[PDB]
Design a protein around this ligand. Structure first.
Ligand SMILES: [Cl-]
Ligand SMILES: [Cl-]
Ligand SMILES: [Mg+2]
Ligand SMILES: [Mg+2]
Ligand SMILES: [Mg+2]
Ligand SMILES: [Mg+2]
Lengths: 106, 134, 96, 197, 171, 188
RNA sequence: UUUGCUCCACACAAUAUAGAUGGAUACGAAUAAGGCGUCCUUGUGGCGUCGCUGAACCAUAGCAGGCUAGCAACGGUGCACUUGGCGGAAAGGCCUUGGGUGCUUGCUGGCGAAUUGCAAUGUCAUUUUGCGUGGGGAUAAAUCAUUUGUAUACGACUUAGA
RNA sequence: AGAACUGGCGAUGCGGGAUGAACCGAACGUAGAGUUAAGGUGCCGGAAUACACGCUCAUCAGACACCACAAAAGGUGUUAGUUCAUCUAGACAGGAAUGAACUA
RNA sequence: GGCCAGCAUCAGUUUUGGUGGCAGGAUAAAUCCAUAGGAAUGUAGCUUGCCUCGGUAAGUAUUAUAGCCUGUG
């Protein structure tokens, strides 16, 4: 069909932070269609991949991935906390991320 | 030539007015107004839906077009007899507002296989409707 | 502390900056308001300054001391050969 | 959800709309605002006119071209309120501001597109009836905005064209609805109703 | 908080000279029993020569509304301290229970007179049994026969930032 | 104290027709028609019959209720304007210099001119609003009569004529010169 | 200044992404009021109906989507053309005529898939520029130096010279 | 400017009070996870454009301790309250309430 | 057997849901049921005066062709 998507769209908002200090080890992720911590419990533990492009090809590809996972919810409006093997770069605040359906509990 | 004044059709807060609860433990259930406390508080009781007799804020309910005769301060047993006689449940289920609620519930209960059947049926209906247009 | 005596400011602040003009031909930044009930005519003309001279004429000014009396005035002469129309330009109104 | 969201600024409170748009820009959403001359500000006209005069008298003493710049257009007034809610001196702030466009009226690129509203910032839903409010178009004119009549004339022409489009679309919708109505009560139609569609 | 009504019965400590001291009772509106017992000694020390170190709490019991689903017109007498002086006031509150009327009273006193909890004494709460004994016009207007009123300018709650239609305020 | 409900009654005579929709009020009578925009009060109009109209306010405060009676007065003035009309009479008051008042037509604008007020050489011109007719009554010395269907139009036009003849740099208690309204009433 | 410049189609390289992953889906006005349908004497008209969110509507099945057969309709849609009209606020878009051609899941069939080994974005988008092809199009100026004084500290400015 | 008791700064970073030696919270080896303090949750800015009852419209509103100021005296602005008198035996203005004096 | 990962079964710490059995109080208070008394923001009935042949208006009337309140069980 015209669509082949098997993930949920998400946005990288910022790092975990106080008013003046941030923590790059934890990133805040907004998931489309989730506006409640109760709904956000469904996505706990799901894998997150950030997909970006580079001019140089290394292992037969010009596309690179940063992998992560949803750890816990955040606030009252459906935001969740995520952790990646390497911390997401700060320039990606406002960029799209992919939330997959595995590992699956359904 | 007669005077023409446009009339408003507000739903009035009154004894016997049927309301729909949108927040709390009794969300989605019907209840009747028994007595008015103040500008923002009324006493409601829906026995058929299992709504306990309680004093509730007017910001927690939605007024409905339905209304039935009911004495002021009527008790739960009296409300039940009046509610059944007026057939409030049957009149509510015949409105497009209630059907829209029922349809919304049916949409979310569909399975993946049933959603596939909906697409097949929709395409078949589309073929007939498009043909009739031309 | 306040200046001891008050005097008016030297110069006019509405003619700043005192810089060289962008072009030798000065720009007409405003035209007379159009009256659509009149025949088409020009609103400006081009000429070259030649010099000044002196004239004598009678004064027609009731109530003046020099009424009905000759006065001497200075004038400026502008050489104005006819101009040639070589095109037209249209403008439209825009929120900018 | 749309790649570009077009907001109709008519009937919106400037401050509450500005906070909503600023958050959207920082999240990576492109926003276009049209009809900025129809924005509303809470409070009577004289109060807001007085407030702008207080803004007008602030400037660098030794050089007026260095101090705060006072933009008179309704679109730029909304821009000023929006830029104050964004860290515009950073690269992240600059990138966010590039996702925003504000116009007076509805320019041709967006007059055939869909316009949405923001209920959180709607004046009719927020202000209690009887409270005084000011229209941004009138306020801008009193402080030196020159193009109020030009925008009004262009908007009148656009509405005439839009009305003709709606009349044609409405007639087509009536014919389509009748086709669906006569296609009901069939075997396919009954099955769709059982499944919710 | 959500007030509850208690009865607190107290006595002076028994002595060899004076056995079986008199029992004193009062009704207290408070959030919990710890606050209720604190309030009991606060008012007792204003009426009798006694304090906690020379007294004992005999019984504390929660008092429930006899008819928690009946609309009642309550008459409330209060004494409160303003920024300069003390005043007595009478107010009328229409609700279904005493605890609900008292909670409304504290909100009303704080809103209209800036009176905190520490500055207010509740002299008496009673139910106005008969109509025509109501002497405040903001309560009499709800006692009219066949009362009806609309709710103009309905404002609906939106769960989404953007709306694709101009909202209506009909009701 | 947020009164639950307040109402006012408007009486409609036999020959008057009133059309109200979206707070736009139009009255039609034998003498003419009048209109008024009232989208600034937030009231509700209801029709009882062809002879009675009620206007109400629901859950309104002291200030909001006070405007309910004003709306009744404005509509009543519209009704009696188109069935009876308004007539304002003014008198010329002077001590030494006679005041000459005439009607002039300047570029089709129907002004009224005042001459020789306190011996002034200045010419005083007052515009005449639409719907107001000016006639100089006979058998009465120094009187001008203004008539119309709108009370606001007639009263404001007469007020403009009075304000234009104010004395300056003099003790106004002694210099009682001017044109003052002397009677307010109805044409019929 | 050694066959340069420009537009068109694809051929290969390099370059980069503030961040495609079914569709930005077009009346205006009012909100103490409106939308839609219908009727008449066409109005500030009568009657019916709707709201209480887009939780919608459209689209959506096939090797990221193959190779073939038949039935019922004469519809739906893509591409390249073509008729006409409209759009100047930044129009660079919208609508329409005609035929050609591919697909059609509206219905019924027949073959193909594996081994990427139990997951690894598993690569399917658009930004710019350069080097080779061939199908067309077009054959200039500015500056220095000299000169002028309506100009001028120097630059700049204003004039002239095959 | 000079004393008393205690806690502090000096000798001390860290979270909060925009900013500050002394205030609030809490005192410090290198890291991970969880929970909090004081302070906050429209946007800048991490976190409810949360819920509930009222009050306020300012042609110089207001917005949080230390702290970065405002008074006496006034207002038929609006809100609640105290006392007294008139009023069903029709008051007040010219058919249901009204008058006066005070309080915050 | 060096680098990076997936799943299952456990241990330590912690976070967020579903669900079961008991205890206490005025052995919750209510609702509900039975019974006695009472009233009005007075239901039926009845009288009265105008009323576009039934609609109000005010007197009587305490459950009747609506109901409610209080006590006790
Ligand atoms: Cl100057
Ligand atoms: Cl030079
Ligand atoms: Mg200027
Ligand atoms: Mg030292
Ligand atoms: Mg500070
Ligand atoms: Mg935030």
């Amino acid at each position: 069909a015209e669509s082949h998507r098997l993930y949920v769209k998400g946005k990288h908002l910022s790092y975990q932070r106080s008013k003046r200090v941030n923590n790059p080890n934890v990133s805040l992720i907004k998931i489309e269609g989730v506006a409640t911590p109760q709904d956000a419990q469904f996505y706990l533990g799901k894998r997150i991949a950030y997909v970006y492009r580079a001019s140089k090809e290394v292992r037969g590809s010009k596309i690179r991935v940063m992998w992560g996972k949803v750890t816990r919810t955040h606030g009252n409006s459906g935001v969740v906390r995520a952790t990646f093997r390497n911390n997401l770069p700060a320039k990606t605040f406002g960029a799209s991320v992919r939330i997959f359906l595995y590992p699956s509990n359904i | 030539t007669d005077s023409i004044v446009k009339a408003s059709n507000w739903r009035l807060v009154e004894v016997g007015r049927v309301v729909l609860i949108k927040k709390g433990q009794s969300a989605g259930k019907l209840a009747a107004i028994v007595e008015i406390i103040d500008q923002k508080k009324v006493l409601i009781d829906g026995p058929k839906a299992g709504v306990p007799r309680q004093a509730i804020n007017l910001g927690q309910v939605v007024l409905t077009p339905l209304t039935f005769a009911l004495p002021r301060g009527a008790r739960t047993a009296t409300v039940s007899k009046k509610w059944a006689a007026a057939a409030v449940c049957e009149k509510w289920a015949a409105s497009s507002w209630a059907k829209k609620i029922a349809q919304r519930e049916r949409r979310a209960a569909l399975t993946d296989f049933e959603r596939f059947q909906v697409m097949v049926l929709r395409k078949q209906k589309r073929y007939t409707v498009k043909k009739a247009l031309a | 502390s306040h200046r001891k005596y008050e005097a008016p400011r030297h110069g006019h602040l509405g003619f700043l900056p005192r810089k060289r003009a962008a072009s030798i031909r000065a720009r007409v930044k405003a035209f007379p308001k159009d009256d659509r009930s009149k025949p088409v005519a020009l609103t400006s003309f081009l000429g070259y300054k030649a010099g000044m001279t002196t004239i004598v004429r009678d004064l027609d000014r009731p109530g003046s001391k020099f009424h009905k009396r000759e006065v001497v005035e200075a004038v400026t002469v502008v050489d104005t050969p006819p101009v040639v129309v070589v095109g037209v330009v249209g403008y439209v109104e825009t929120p900018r | 959800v749309e790649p570009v969201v077009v907001i109709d600024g008519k009937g919106h409170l400037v401050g509450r709309l500005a906070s909503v748009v600023a958050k959207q820009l920082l999240n990576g959403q492109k926003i276009v605002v049209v009809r900025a001359e129809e924005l509303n500000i809470s409070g009577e006209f004289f109060r807001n006119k007085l407030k702008y005069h207080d803004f007008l008298r602030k400037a660098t003493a030794f050089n007026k071209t260095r101090g705060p710049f006072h933009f008179r257009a309704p679109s730029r007034i909304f821009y000023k309120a929006l830029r104050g809610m964004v860290s515009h001196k950073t690269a992240r702030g600059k990138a966010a501001l590039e996702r925003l466009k504000v116009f007076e009226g509805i320019p041709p690129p967006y007059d055939k597109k869909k316009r949405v509203v923001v209920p959180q910032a709607l004046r009719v839903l927020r202000l209690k009836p009887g409270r005084k409010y000011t229209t941004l178009g009138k306020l801008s004119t009193s402080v030196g905005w020159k193009y109020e009549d030009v925008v009004a004339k262009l908007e009148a022409k656009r509405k005439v064209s839009s009305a003709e489009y709606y009349a044609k679309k409405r007639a087509f919708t009536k014919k389509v609805a009748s086709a669906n109505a006569t296609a009901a009560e069939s075997d396919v139609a009954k099955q769709l109703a059982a499944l919710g569609y | 908080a959500h007030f509850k009504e208690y009865q607190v019965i107290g006595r002076r400590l028994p002595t060899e000279s004076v056995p079986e001291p008199k029992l004193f009772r009062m009704r207290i509106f408070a959030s919990n029993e710890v606050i209720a017992k604190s309030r009991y000694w606060y008012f007792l020390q204003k009426l009798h020569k006694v304090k906690k170190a020379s007294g004992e709490i005999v019984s504390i019991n929660q008092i429930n509304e006899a008819h928690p689903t009946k609309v009642k017109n309550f008459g409330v007498w209060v004494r409160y301290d303003s920024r300069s002086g003390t005043h007595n006031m009478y107010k009328e509150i229409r609700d279904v229970s005493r605890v609900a009327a008292v909670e409304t009273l504290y909100q009303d006193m704080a809103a209209r007179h800036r009176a905190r909890f520490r500055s207010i004494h509740i002299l008496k709460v009673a139910e106005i049994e008969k109509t025509a004994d109501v002497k405040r016009q903001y309560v009499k207007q709800f006692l009219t026969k066949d009362l009806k009123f609309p709710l103009p300018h309905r404002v609906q709650k939106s769960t989404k930032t953007f709306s694709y239609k101009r909202p209506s305020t009909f009701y | 104290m947020k009164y639950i409900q307040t109402e006012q009654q408007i009486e409609v005579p036999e020959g008057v027709t009133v059309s109200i929709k979206s707070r736009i009020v139009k009255v039609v009578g034998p003498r003419g028609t009048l209109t008024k925009n009232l989208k600034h009060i937030d009231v509700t109009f209801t029709k009882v019959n062809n002879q009675l109209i009620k206007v109400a306010v629901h859950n309104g405060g002291r200030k909001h209720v006070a405007a309910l009676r004003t709306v009744k007065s404005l509509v009543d003035n519209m009704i009696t304007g188109v069935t009876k009309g308004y007539k304002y009479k003014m008198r010329y008051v002077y001590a030494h210099f006679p005041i000459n008042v005439n009607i002039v037509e300047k570029d089709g604008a129907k002004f009224i001119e005042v001459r020789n007020f306190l011996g002034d050489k200045k010419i005083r011109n007052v515009p005449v609003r639409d719907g107001v007719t000016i006639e100089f009554s006979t058998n009465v010395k120094d009187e001008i009569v203004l008539s119309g269907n709108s009370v606001e139009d007639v009263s404001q036009n007469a007020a403009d004529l009075q304000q234009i003849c104010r004395v300056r740099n003099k003790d106004i208690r002694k210099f009682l010169d001017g044109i003052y309204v002397s009677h307010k009433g109805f044409i019929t």
